[model samples]
Target: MSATAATVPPAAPAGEGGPPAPPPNLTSNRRLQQTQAQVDEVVDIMRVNVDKVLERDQKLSELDDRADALQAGASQFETSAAKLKRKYWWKNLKMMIILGVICAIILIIIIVYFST
Candidate 1:
């Protein structure tokens, strides 16, 4: 003899068996809509503010790049100035030595003329 098992149907869930529960605070529908609109407006304003900050940051980045370029130019200028100083130093030294010798010769002649 084969035993037959009785099949049970699945019961419906508590909330699913009926209409969905009402949203909280059914009173003051106008106030709720107004508050929601205000929140959306605030969110939009914040988004605009964030966009402005991003734009300012981009501008700042450009300025920073320009400043870096200027700094690099300044360093190059310093190196060129140092090179110029080094290049002129020996030339000036040689000129000064020649002028000293000429002046000594002129002074010696003047002293010999006075002695005689």
Candidate 2:
């Protein structure tokens, strides 16, 4: 009779670089959840950056309007001397002399009326 050695395969000898088998569905599920949480955290940071970008654009837009207003003020400053020349006193003197003549005519009429 022939005798074979009874050494069946013992538990798989752990490979040097890897596990000999796969088993942990629970661990797989938990690792997947951690990855999902990390992704969500990244999304939150992205949302914050987006809001900051929007706020920056909004502030820049407001300053653009204020810049236009400042330009208008500078334009008015340029026109200030032009306004002074246009509204100067020669026209005012002619208007006053005509008004004085009318007043003198009225005064003479009233004096004659009273005397008569």
Which has the greatest TM-score? 2
Give the root-mean-square deviation of each candidate in angstroms: 27.8, 32.9
Clashing pairs in 1: none
lDDT of 1 by residue, 1-116 (tens): 49787777877565736655444465446776676654665787899998986775464555543354443345666677788788757777889999999999999999999996
C-alpha lDDT values of all predictions: 0.70, 0.70
**What TM-score, over all chains together, does every model reach?**
0.26, 0.29
Per-residue CA lDDT of model 2 for 42-105, tens digit only, reads 7888999989867654645655433544433456666777778877646878889999999999
Give candidate 2 misplaced runs (Cα > 4 Å).
1-66, 69-79, 86-89
How accurate locally is residue 64 in candidate 2, as Cα lDDT from 0 to 100? 45
Whole-model alpha-carbon lDDT for candidate 1: 0.70
